[PDB]
Amino acid sequence: PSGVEGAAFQSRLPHDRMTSQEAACFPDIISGPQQTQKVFLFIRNRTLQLWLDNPKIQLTFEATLQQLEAPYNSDTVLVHRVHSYLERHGLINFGIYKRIKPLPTKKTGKVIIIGSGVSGLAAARQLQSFGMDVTLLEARDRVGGRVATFRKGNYVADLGAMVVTGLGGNPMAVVSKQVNMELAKIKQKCPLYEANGQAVPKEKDEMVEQEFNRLLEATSYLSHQLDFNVLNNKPVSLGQALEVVIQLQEKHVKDEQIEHWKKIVKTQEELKELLNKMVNLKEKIKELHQQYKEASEVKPPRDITAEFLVKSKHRDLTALCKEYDELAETQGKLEEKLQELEANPPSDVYLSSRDRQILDWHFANLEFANATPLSTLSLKHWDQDDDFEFTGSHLTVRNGYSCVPVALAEGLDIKLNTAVRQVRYTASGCEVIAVNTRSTSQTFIYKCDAVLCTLPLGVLKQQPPAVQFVPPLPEWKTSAVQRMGFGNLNKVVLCFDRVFWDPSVNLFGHVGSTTASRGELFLFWNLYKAPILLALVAGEAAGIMENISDDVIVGRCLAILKGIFGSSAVPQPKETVVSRWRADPWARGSYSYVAAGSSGNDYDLMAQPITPGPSIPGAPQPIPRLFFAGEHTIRNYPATVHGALLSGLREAGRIADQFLGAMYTL
Amino acid sequence: PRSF
Amino acid sequence: RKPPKGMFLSQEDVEAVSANATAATTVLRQLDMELVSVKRQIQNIKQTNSALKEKLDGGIEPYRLPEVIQKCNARWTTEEQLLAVQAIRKYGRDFQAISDVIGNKSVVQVKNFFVNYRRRFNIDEVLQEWEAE
Ligand SMILES: Cc1cc2c(cc1C)N(C(=O)CCc1ccc(-c3ccccc3)cc1)c1c([nH]c(=O)[nH]c1=O)N2C[C@H](O)[C@H](O)[C@H](O)COP(=O)(O)OP(=O)(O)OC[C@H]1O[C@@H](n2cnc3c(N)ncnc32)[C@H](O)[C@@H]1O
């Protein structure tokens, strides 16, 4: 939209009512008269606007009040609360702004943040922005976490995130103006080439795609309308429901052939009975004629009984010649039904072998979206985050998404090559125990008021623990960790000397031999200046291609490439990098997915902070000391960068409110 | 999530 | 509310395809077996009907008669009246056939004739005999 009202939309906020957030901070307003709400909503919206229209400079309260006009700029404290609320919860003055007011050195409270990922860096920025003392512990020798970027010479290529999913309400929208980011549009034209290397004709392409989408819709019907959500005391997965749906369409085809061929036998046997009347009638007319003709043989003069006999035999022959004449009508009237039905046979099969493979590539696309085999996705809940979609078209980062982490890292206490091994949290504060990854003998102790954990979900999932919590995380937190899914998705990046592909095509598919390998290198991306093609490895193929050497993997890529463009047009790559995310021990996977038997309420469980028991028993119930951010912690935007970033902003606000106090809630 |  | 058009999905079916691991390829094998079963039945009847058509070569063209164009009359000559009494005994109340057998009268004056000579030709008696067959 447009106005102060698209400033609310660009902040994921409804511009005509108050959120559950704000009812919490402004319970006076929401329980009060509706006129004041309209005021508040306007101050909320206009302030958001002011920040968004120039997000390279801090939006100070004083400045905010100036642009405000009457009657709205008449309650200076209502404005002051709004502004502080927005600044706390990261809706304004988040990211990389120049600060008018050089922040004071009065540092109150100490926070250790585990992980220098985008969730981590975003909180760090915000906490330091709030005058806390913040230290980041990072196991790797670089920032970004799962925003990895390869750089050798002119060659730049993300091995991690690479798509900004469209800017309508995206916090990266703000970040993209704060950082020189080259956003590139993704052209939807994507042609699939099959195993041999011949482009799939458009007719097929549109035909299959439409079936895919009808097949998805079918599972949805099958989920909501028929409550097929549990089978043999086990939650049903999307992949199961798809098979049941495809079986039932292959079942329909057969049901449909059977009733058609039975329509033919219904009338063949109707004919059969007709021709028996007609064989018998014709043979019964044989003797009639013979009789009559013998009766004309008796020459006149004739007595009357002999005249009657010629005349009667003559009638019964016409009488019997009617019947046979009209039965050849009926025979003719059923002789073309059999020609009609024969030439109107219904569908031979539901999907042909060639067709089914193409369908498998549309399933590889879906397995790549959710970084996991469709047998693992909850049928019920897997599509719960297409409700909060961003408007606009998906984009890619042409300069390496890493430029964003790196930009965030300016100004921040980041200890690299520091692997946390134990987190101790007590009623009186916390100890984080880390080692050096270079030499694991050097041991470090970090003491703090609060720990912000942004450890990847797959790290949190390791048994036996890569990180021990003292005391152990409670049953409700560990069970959410088991229930949730951490999937896997890998990339092969291919560096050449000349664009030998269609440079007006961002991406093109390869259709695979089998089902079992629909994800093995099934999609290629061309997004960078240099000759670089990115190949995805999705689904069950991802977890398997990690046990296979680089050159073999590049080997199969080359083969595929050769088939689609001819063996002489594809030279060897100058530089090759293949990732291996499930192997990476600071990831253990690529991103979370809504596993069968999990739900969106688990993502909320992950974000609940932990409160230790009292030191002195019968002492007052303490504060919470262990906080959680990262993409696996945000229900409405999981498995993305924008979701990671929002989760960092969330916890910084939650920590600042619990350690600096919220003076905006009176 | 589904991309394009 | 409804399955997408061209998708077929009822609660009866799905239960039958989920009843065990192989309940799908079961339900899908009979259908193949009962398809070929009906295909061979079709083949059989086509053969059977083909033979019947042969026995019908020539139809009934040699056994057909020419139609006699004939202006109907209204006078009943003794000969004509005698045809009728016999016609009745063989056609009784098929006034249509009876006129076709005389071939000179109308279907209505045949009906008339019955009452006019009813007494004299003992039609009642005649019809009684015709009932006994
Ligand atoms: C691995 C990977 C991740 C992503 C992608 C690719 C790959 C290979 N991306 C994709 O191709 C497609 C995904 C996608 C795209 C659209 C949609 C969608 C949804 C709805 C509607 C339309 C579209 C859905 C999915 C991709 C993408 N996020 C995105 O928007 N754009 C993308 O296009 N995604 C996700 C993104 O990549 C991550 O979700 C994000 O990066 C989260 O980061 P964090 O939660 O902060 O976590 P971290 O892992 O970054 O940070 C952890 C730090 O902990 C350190 N650490 C560990 N252990 C220790 C220890 N013991 N001691 C000390 N430090 C430790 C570690 O060293 C690291 O420093």
mmCIF file of C-alpha atoms and ligand atoms in Angstrom, chain A residues 115-119 137-140 144-147 159-163 165 369 385 394 418-420 454-456 459 467 489 491 581 586 590-591 630-631 639-641 644, chain B residues 1, ligand 1:
data_model
loop_
_atom_site.group_PDB
_atom_site.id
_atom_site.type_symbol
_atom_site.label_atom_id
_atom_site.label_comp_id
_atom_site.label_asym_id
_atom_site.label_seq_id
_atom_site.Cartn_x
_atom_site.Cartn_y
_atom_site.Cartn_z
ATOM 1 C CA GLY A 115 26.531 -17.731 17.776
ATOM 2 C CA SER A 116 27.433 -14.973 15.364
ATOM 3 C CA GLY A 117 24.557 -15.799 13.021
ATOM 4 C CA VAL A 118 22.059 -13.261 11.772
ATOM 5 C CA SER A 119 19.824 -13.927 14.786
ATOM 6 C CA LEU A 137 30.962 -16.408 21.057
ATOM 7 C CA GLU A 138 31.391 -17.926 17.598
ATOM 8 C CA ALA A 139 32.818 -21.394 16.820
ATOM 9 C CA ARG A 140 33.711 -20.525 13.220
ATOM 10 C CA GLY A 144 27.155 -15.201 9.266
ATOM 11 C CA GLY A 145 26.642 -18.803 10.214
ATOM 12 C CA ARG A 146 24.329 -20.184 7.561
ATOM 13 C CA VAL A 147 24.869 -17.079 5.450
ATOM 14 C CA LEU A 159 26.574 -21.584 -0.256
ATOM 15 C CA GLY A 160 23.918 -20.606 2.278
ATOM 16 C CA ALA A 161 20.955 -18.328 1.871
ATOM 17 C CA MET A 162 20.731 -16.581 -1.483
ATOM 18 C CA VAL A 163 17.104 -15.497 -1.973
ATOM 19 C CA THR A 165 11.789 -13.530 -0.543
ATOM 20 C CA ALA A 369 11.776 -25.542 -0.483
ATOM 21 C CA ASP A 385 3.729 -19.897 6.868
ATOM 22 C CA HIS A 394 11.824 -13.050 -4.913
ATOM 23 C CA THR A 418 35.464 -20.043 20.342
ATOM 24 C CA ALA A 419 33.329 -23.151 20.686
ATOM 25 C CA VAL A 420 30.918 -23.122 23.624
ATOM 26 C CA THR A 454 21.235 -18.919 18.802
ATOM 27 C CA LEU A 455 22.633 -22.397 18.326
ATOM 28 C CA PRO A 456 21.255 -24.125 15.218
ATOM 29 C CA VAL A 459 23.389 -28.511 17.036
ATOM 30 C CA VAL A 467 26.820 -28.417 24.315
ATOM 31 C CA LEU A 489 19.909 -28.995 1.397
ATOM 32 C CA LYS A 491 24.822 -26.772 -3.237
ATOM 33 C CA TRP A 581 25.750 -28.877 5.675
ATOM 34 C CA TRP A 586 28.089 -25.841 13.747
ATOM 35 C CA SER A 590 20.398 -26.464 6.709
ATOM 36 C CA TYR A 591 17.123 -25.212 8.240
ATOM 37 C CA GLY A 630 17.480 -18.234 15.530
ATOM 38 C CA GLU A 631 15.292 -19.327 12.627
ATOM 39 C CA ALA A 639 13.830 -21.303 8.102
ATOM 40 C CA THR A 640 14.665 -17.891 6.623
ATOM 41 C CA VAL A 641 17.098 -15.052 7.140
ATOM 42 C CA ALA A 644 16.398 -15.278 12.085
ATOM 43 C CA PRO B 1 7.066 -22.150 1.966
HETATM 44 C C1 LIG D 1 21.645 -23.562 4.930
HETATM 45 C C2 LIG D 1 20.740 -22.736 4.067
HETATM 46 C C3 LIG D 1 19.817 -21.899 4.626
HETATM 47 C C4 LIG D 1 18.981 -21.133 3.828
HETATM 48 C C5 LIG D 1 19.107 -21.215 2.454
HETATM 49 C C6 LIG D 1 20.018 -22.077 1.875
HETATM 50 C C7 LIG D 1 20.841 -22.829 2.648
HETATM 51 C C8 LIG D 1 21.839 -23.747 2.016
HETATM 52 N N1 LIG D 1 18.274 -20.519 1.676
HETATM 53 C C9 LIG D 1 17.815 -21.025 0.481
HETATM 54 O O1 LIG D 1 18.567 -21.223 -0.441
HETATM 55 C C10 LIG D 1 16.342 -21.289 0.370
HETATM 56 C C11 LIG D 1 15.681 -21.424 1.715
HETATM 57 C C12 LIG D 1 14.308 -20.809 1.733
HETATM 58 C C13 LIG D 1 13.978 -19.804 0.856
HETATM 59 C C14 LIG D 1 12.722 -19.234 0.858
HETATM 60 C C15 LIG D 1 11.749 -19.648 1.747
HETATM 61 C C16 LIG D 1 10.399 -19.036 1.728
HETATM 62 C C17 LIG D 1 9.537 -19.146 2.807
HETATM 63 C C18 LIG D 1 8.278 -18.578 2.769
HETATM 64 C C19 LIG D 1 7.860 -17.900 1.658
HETATM 65 C C20 LIG D 1 8.690 -17.784 0.580
HETATM 66 C C21 LIG D 1 9.949 -18.348 0.610
HETATM 67 C C22 LIG D 1 12.079 -20.662 2.630
HETATM 68 C C23 LIG D 1 13.340 -21.223 2.623
HETATM 69 C C24 LIG D 1 17.738 -19.327 2.214
HETATM 70 C C25 LIG D 1 17.571 -19.251 3.561
HETATM 71 N N2 LIG D 1 16.994 -18.159 4.108
HETATM 72 C C26 LIG D 1 16.560 -17.128 3.334
HETATM 73 O O2 LIG D 1 16.057 -16.138 3.814
HETATM 74 N N3 LIG D 1 16.738 -17.257 1.998
HETATM 75 C C27 LIG D 1 17.306 -18.353 1.407
HETATM 76 O O3 LIG D 1 17.421 -18.381 0.197
HETATM 77 N N4 LIG D 1 18.029 -20.266 4.382
HETATM 78 C C28 LIG D 1 17.988 -20.084 5.837
HETATM 79 C C29 LIG D 1 18.997 -19.175 6.454
HETATM 80 O O4 LIG D 1 20.185 -19.557 5.906
HETATM 81 C C30 LIG D 1 19.121 -19.425 7.950
HETATM 82 O O5 LIG D 1 17.873 -19.727 8.444
HETATM 83 C C31 LIG D 1 19.610 -18.254 8.779
HETATM 84 O O6 LIG D 1 20.943 -17.959 8.401
HETATM 85 C C32 LIG D 1 19.539 -18.562 10.251
HETATM 86 O O7 LIG D 1 20.673 -18.120 11.008
HETATM 87 P P1 LIG D 1 20.644 -18.270 12.558
HETATM 88 O O8 LIG D 1 19.380 -18.794 13.059
HETATM 89 O O9 LIG D 1 21.101 -16.953 12.986
HETATM 90 O O10 LIG D 1 21.735 -19.369 12.753
HETATM 91 P P2 LIG D 1 23.111 -19.540 12.051
HETATM 92 O O11 LIG D 1 23.374 -20.961 11.882
HETATM 93 O O12 LIG D 1 23.183 -18.583 10.955
HETATM 94 O O13 LIG D 1 24.030 -19.031 13.186
HETATM 95 C C33 LIG D 1 24.440 -20.022 14.102
HETATM 96 C C34 LIG D 1 25.810 -19.658 14.580
HETATM 97 O O14 LIG D 1 26.113 -20.496 15.706
HETATM 98 C C35 LIG D 1 27.449 -20.863 15.608
HETATM 99 N N5 LIG D 1 27.659 -21.992 16.480
HETATM 100 C C36 LIG D 1 27.150 -23.247 16.377
HETATM 101 N N6 LIG D 1 27.520 -24.035 17.342
HETATM 102 C C37 LIG D 1 28.310 -23.238 18.137
HETATM 103 C C38 LIG D 1 29.006 -23.480 19.323
HETATM 104 N N7 LIG D 1 29.033 -24.644 19.944
HETATM 105 N N8 LIG D 1 29.700 -22.464 19.852
HETATM 106 C C39 LIG D 1 29.687 -21.290 19.230
HETATM 107 N N9 LIG D 1 29.089 -20.952 18.107
HETATM 108 C C40 LIG D 1 28.401 -21.978 17.613
HETATM 109 C C41 LIG D 1 27.620 -21.144 14.138
HETATM 110 O O15 LIG D 1 28.992 -21.140 13.857
HETATM 111 C C42 LIG D 1 26.943 -19.899 13.587
HETATM 112 O O16 LIG D 1 27.829 -18.800 13.624
#
